[PDB]
Amino acid sequence: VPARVLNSLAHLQDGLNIFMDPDWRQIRHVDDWALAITMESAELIDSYPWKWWKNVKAQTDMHNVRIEIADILHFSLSGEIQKRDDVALKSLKEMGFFCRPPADDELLELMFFPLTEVASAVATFRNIIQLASIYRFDLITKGLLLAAQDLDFNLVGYYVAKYTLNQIRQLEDNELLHECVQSVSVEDVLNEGTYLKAWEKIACSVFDAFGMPEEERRHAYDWLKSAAL
């Protein structure tokens, strides 16, 4: 996943954040993001049957898991931006604090697959809670993208689709969104070079799909275009 792409993603988030409160980056604090990443991580974990003593038989909600990975991605990028000392990660590692199932370089040994299995997920997403602990949003974004790759979940497709809907809502939905992501590939939306062509294809599939008359779009694609930096 090319850095260029990672940067672009954050731009869009900044757009999203701006609409809700245009002074987010002054008012808002690095510690809020870390909080929100901690809660939605918990939220994700609660979709799995981790409680040894409660409905032990419960089937996992891998759908909700996917939509939670994205919910977290929003807060992560928001903290990434906002964060604009290092040997503090490896320090926690030797302290053996980060954890593992009882059975980028630097962040792979904290992720545990397949995410479809409970212990592997619990491990993984507690380790996001910890990366957050110490404000490492950048690795939580890279981690979230891994989670999704393991889950065969086209996360940045879905993030752009969902971004473009928010655009409409200023000027079952989920089912339509996932359908727009299809018109465009996984390899495509990440491939440095073609990616901004491909994100524009998704955007445009959303607008059509929802019914943004061609005529009200004169500026819809603007920030998206500016997201190339």
Ligand X SMILES: O=c1ccn([C@H]2C[C@H](O)[C@@H](COP(=O)(O)OP(=O)(O)O)O2)c(=O)[nH]1
Annotated binding site for dUDP: 13, 17, 51-53, 71, 162, 169, 174
Backbone angles phi, psi at 102, to 5 degrees: -50, -30
Backbone angles phi, psi at 86, to 5 degrees: -90, -50
Determine the Cα–Cα distance for residues 194 and 65; give it in Å rounded to an integer. 29
The region of 16-24, 124-132, 135-143, 189-197 touching ligand X under the rule CB under 6 A is 16-24
Least distance from C-beta 155 to ligand X, angstroms?
A: 13
Determine the Cα–Cα distance for residues 204 and 201; give it in Å rounded to an integer. 5
Q: Is 87 exposed, middle or buried (0-12, 13-18, 19+ CB in 10 A)?
A: exposed
Among 66, 136, 162, 201, binds ligand X (CB under 6 A): 162
Alpha carbons within 13 A on the beta-carbon side of 167:
27
Check binding of 16 to ligand X (CB under 6 A).
yes
Annotated binding residues? 13, 17, 51-53, 71, 162, 169, 174
Closest by CA position to 9, among listed 68, 70, 86: 70
Among 3, 27, 53, 96, binds ligand X (CB under 6 A): 53
Closest by CA position to 62, among listed 75, 81, 49: 49
Determine the Cα–Cα distance for residues 73 and 127; give it in Å rounded to an integer. 15
Hey, which residues between 34 and 53 contact a copy of itself (CB under 8 A)?
34-35, 38-39, 42, 45-46, 50, 52-53
The region of 1-9, 14-22, 110-118, 199-207 touching ligand X under the rule CB under 6 A is 14-22
Binding mask 172-191 for ligand X (x = CB under 6 A): --x-----------------
Interacting residues toward a copy of itself by CB under 8 A = 20-21, 28-29, 31-32, 34-35, 38-39, 42, 45-46, 50, 52-58, 88, 91-92, 95-97, 99, 102, 122, 126, 129-130, 133-135, 170
